[PDB]
Amino acid sequence: LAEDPENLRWFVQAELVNGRWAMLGVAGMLLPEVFTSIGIINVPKWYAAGKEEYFASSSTLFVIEFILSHYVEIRRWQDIKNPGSVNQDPIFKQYSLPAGEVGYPGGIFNPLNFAPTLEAKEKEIANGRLMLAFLGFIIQHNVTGKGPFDNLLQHISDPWHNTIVQ
Amino acid sequence: PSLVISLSTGLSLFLGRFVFFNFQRENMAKQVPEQNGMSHFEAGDTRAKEYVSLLKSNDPVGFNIVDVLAWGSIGHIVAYYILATASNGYDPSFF
Amino acid sequence: DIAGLTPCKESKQFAKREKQALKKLQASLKLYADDSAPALAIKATMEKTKKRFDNYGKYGLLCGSDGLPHLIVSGDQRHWGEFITPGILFLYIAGWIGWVGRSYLIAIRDEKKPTQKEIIIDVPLASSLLFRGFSWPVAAYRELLNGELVDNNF
Amino acid sequence: SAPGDFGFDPLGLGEVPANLERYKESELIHCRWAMLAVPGILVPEALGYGEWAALPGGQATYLGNPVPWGTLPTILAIEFLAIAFVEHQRSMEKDPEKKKYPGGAFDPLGYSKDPKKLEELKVKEIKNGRLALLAFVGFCVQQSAYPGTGPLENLATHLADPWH
Numbered sequence: 001l002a003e004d005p006e007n008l009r010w011f012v013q014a015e016l017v018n019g020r021w022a023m024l025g026v027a028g029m030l031l032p033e034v035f036t037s038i039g040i041i042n043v044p045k046w047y048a049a050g051k052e053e054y055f056a057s058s059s060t061l062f063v064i065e066f067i068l069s070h071y072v073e074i075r076r077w078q079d080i081k082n083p084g085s086v087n088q089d090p091i092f093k094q095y096s097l098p099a100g101e102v103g104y105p106g107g108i109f110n111p112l113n114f115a116p117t118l119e120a121k122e123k124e125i126a127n128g129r130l131m132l133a134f135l136g137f138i139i140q141h142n143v144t145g146k147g148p149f150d151n152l153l154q155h156i157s158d159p160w161h162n163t164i165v166q
Numbered sequence: 167p168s169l170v171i172s173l174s175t176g177l178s179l180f181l182g183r184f185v186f187f188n189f190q191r192e193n194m195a196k197q198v199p200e201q202n203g204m205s206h207f208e209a210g211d212t213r214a215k216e217y218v219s220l221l222k223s224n225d226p227v228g229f230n231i232v233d234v235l236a237w238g239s240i241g242h243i244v245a246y247y248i249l250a251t252a253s254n255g256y257d258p259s260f261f
Numbered sequence: 262d263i264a265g266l267t268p269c270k271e272s273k274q275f276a277k278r279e280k281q282a283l284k285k286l287q288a289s290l291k292l293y294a295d296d297s298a299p300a301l302a303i304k305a306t307m308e309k310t311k312k313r314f315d316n317y318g319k320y321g322l323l324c325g326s327d328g329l330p331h332l333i334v335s336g337d338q339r340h341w342g343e344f345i346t347p348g349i350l351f352l353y354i355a356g357w358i359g360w361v362g363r364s365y366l367i368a369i370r371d372e373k374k375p376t377q378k379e380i381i382i383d384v385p386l387a388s389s390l391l392f393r394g395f396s397w398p399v400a401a402y403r404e405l406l407n408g409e410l411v412d413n414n415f
Numbered sequence: 416s417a418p419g420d421f422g423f424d425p426l427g428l429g430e431v432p433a434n435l436e437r438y439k440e441s442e443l444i445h446c447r448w449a450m451l452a453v454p455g456i457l458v459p460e461a462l463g464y465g466e467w468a469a470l471p472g473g474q475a476t477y478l479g480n481p482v483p484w485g486t487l488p489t490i491l492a493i494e495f496l497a498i499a500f501v502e503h504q505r506s507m508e509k510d511p512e513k514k515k516y517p518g519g520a521f522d523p524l525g526y527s528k529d530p531k532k533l534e535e536l537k538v539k540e541i542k543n544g545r546l547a548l549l550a551f552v553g554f555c556v557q558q559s560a561y562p563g564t565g566p567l568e569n570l571a572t573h574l575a576d577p578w579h
């Protein structure tokens with residue numbers, strides 16, 4: 001009691017993983033936009049290697065990878081109850097040892113730290129969201145569309161479309 | 167198809183594990199201990215139990231099964247008879 | 262598809278319902294509105310239950326005998342959001358009724374004499390603890406089971 | 416996840432520290448008998464040429480109608496009486512000194528003992544034990560579902576998803 005927070009560990013690490021995976025997610029799109037032509041779901045497969053065999057299937061693929069992702073992920077667990085990850089640049093950041101002016105508890109607002117040379121996990125702050133909410137954006141607009149920006153002939157001006165579905 | 171006598175073989179597997187002790191030490195019923203008349207009183211109540219007495223013939227009369235159950239079941243029960251048959255007797259192999 | 266029959270794409274019994282029944286609705290050869298501007302069976306009430314033609318959307322929707330439509334919702338063939346879609350919805354809405362129940366409540370028992378502040382209402386609906394509910398991402402799904410309402414307080 | 420760290424003593428530990436896994440040593444040697452069974456293929460390439468297969472006429476038919484019917488009941492019935500030999504002996508022990516139900520021997524120093532037959536070191540039986548258990552229970556279900564067929568791989572990939 002515990003007046004108030006708290007937390008900590010917690011879901012600040014909560015974010016960064018959103019941040020830095022929403023960032024990647026959008027590398028996803030990056031591709032089909034300059035020398036353009038090729039994407040949406042495009043339910044890839046996803047880049048697809050050689051002419052020496054697959055063939056629709058050989059295998060669930062997809063389904064596996066992430067059995068792997070799976071114990072590597074127990075590993076990041078395998079970190080955050082009890083701080084273990086050499087670099088140590090998510091759990092507070094690196095700059096070895098430190099930040100944990102919030103690892104033993106007592107925050108309220110606590111801003112943080114972590115580049116030796118140099119600066120921060122900060123203006124990696126705000127690419128941090130630009131991209132989470134971007135996705136929000138990204139697989140917002142499909143559910144009707146899939147492409148950006150030509151010139152001033154007759155595109156960027158929104159002409160006629162078709163509700164929501166309804 | 168059914169081993170019917172697969173299992174009646176089987177059940178007096180166990181109650182001959184019954185033929186037991188009417189014979190061997192002393193009287194009946196480890197003599198009526200407690201039956202009629204009525205326990206001390208006892209009283210909560212009450213005893214006894216003993217995780218420690220599942221031996222005695224585990225080994226010996228675990229044969230009892232194979233008795234009747236062998237030669238006296240599927241192999242035509244006592245062929246070695248005769249012993250007063252004329253008001254009749256026999257008896258005669260339904261098998 | 263399952264125990265009853267198939268949807269709307271065909272459902273004979275269902276069809277007959279459309280038709281007699283409503284349309285008898287009709288039933289009134291006239292009954293006067295040759296041009297007249299009130300008596301609205303005429304327009305919709307039928308057509309709003311009616312132009313609901315061989316379309317209702319299309320919804321799958323199973324329809325047994327007499328062809329009144331039955332709800333499976335076992336998450337299969339088509340029928341999933343006849344419980345879950347409007348199920349999580351019932352959950353999310355409530356719980357953000359009582360998340361705030363356990364809120365324009367756990368905000369009082371303190372300061373000075375707090376003995377019925379509640380027969381009047383301090384912030385109406387709470388209008389402060391209000392959005393705490395949509396401003397539940399995760400929320401009680403962690404902080405209920407860890408800390409605050411913490412087993413301690415259990 | 417049953418060995419997800421949990422257990423105290425006579426129940427918790429006591430039941431298992433070697434005891435149950437020392438009884439799970441049997442499991443492994445059963446799966447040494449069973450992995451003395453499966454190796455019928457076990458190897459590619461050698462003959463059988465051609466062992467009790469699909470019931471043609473048992474051991475030697477007997478001079479008289481076979482007791483019940485089938486090879487199964489005659490070889491079976493016995494197995495579960497002639498092996499109760501071992502478990503009788505295996506369930507009469509105690510770990511420290513052996514006398515009867517003697518005076519008083521609970522704990523000073525030396526602390527009781529350890530599974531009677533402990534690790535005695537060689538913590539390598541267990542490293543192979545759960546290795547075997549994990550197999551028997553595990554991808555042994557590669558051959559525990561719909562294995563009406565046998566060995567005939569023909570080039571493609573690997574795996575097949577959820578099915579059937």
Ligand code: CLA
Pocket residue numbers: 358359361362363364365366382384385386387
């Ligand atoms: C905010 C409120 C609140 C909350 C979180 C609960 C929670 C609970 N009630 Mg409950 N209850 C309430 C108000 C509330 N009640 C009221 C006002 C009454 C009328 C006396 C009851 C009568 C009642 C009974 C008879 C039972 C419960 C039971 C329960 C428990 C079972 C849930 C259930 O299925 O009943 C569903 C909930 C109701 C029937 C309550 C109806 C009232 C709701 C709609 C309150 C809505 C908020 C209200 C307008 C407050 C104003 C907001 C303010 C911040 C400005 C659960 C702990 C059961 C129990 O004890 O088992 C654990 C038991 O059967 N309640």
Ligand SMILES: CC(=CC=C/C(C)=C/C=C/C=C(C)/C=C/C=C(C)/C=C/C1=C(C)CCCC1(C)C)/C=C/C1=C(C)CCCC1(C)C
Pocket residue numbers: 347348350351352354355
């Ligand atoms: C949100 C909601 C709601 C509601 C509603 C509600 C939420 C209602 C409730 C109500 C309540 C009540 C009504 C209560 C009552 C109470 C009582 C009745 C009590 C009684 C008593 C007591 C008090 C105790 C004991 C005694 C007696 C018994 C007397 C939902 C919505 C929806 C819909 C439409 C449908 C679909 C889904 C959704 C979309 C989601």
Ligand SMILES: CC1=C(/C=C/C(C)=C/C=C/C(C)=C\C=C\C=C(C)\C=C\C=C(C)\C=C\C2=C(C)CCCC2(C)C)C(C)(C)CCC1
Pocket residue numbers: 355356357358359360361362363401
């Ligand atoms: C899938 C599905 C299913 C399943 C089911 C089941 C299995 C159930 C059970 C269930 C259960 C088992 C439940 C329970 C739980 C537990 C608990 C424990 C809960 C809770 C809680 C709480 C406590 C809450 C609270 C609250 C909230 C959150 C809101 C506000 C405040 C209050 C109070 C209200 C069903 C059937 C539906 C049908 C089909 C679908």
Ligand SMILES: CCCCCCCCCCCCO[C@H]1O[C@H](CO)[C@@H](O[C@H]2O[C@H](CO)[C@@H](O)[C@H](O)[C@H]2O)[C@H](O)[C@H]1O
Pocket residue numbers: 416417419
């Ligand atoms: C991150 C979210 C919070 C996570 C906190 C960690 C707690 C998670 C619970 C794990 C404790 C497991 O305990 C509980 O497992 C299952 C029931 O819950 C059941 O058990 C089941 O899996 C157990 C492994 O643990 C084994 O018993 C068997 O696999 C199966 O029976 C038991 O009923 C119970 O012992």
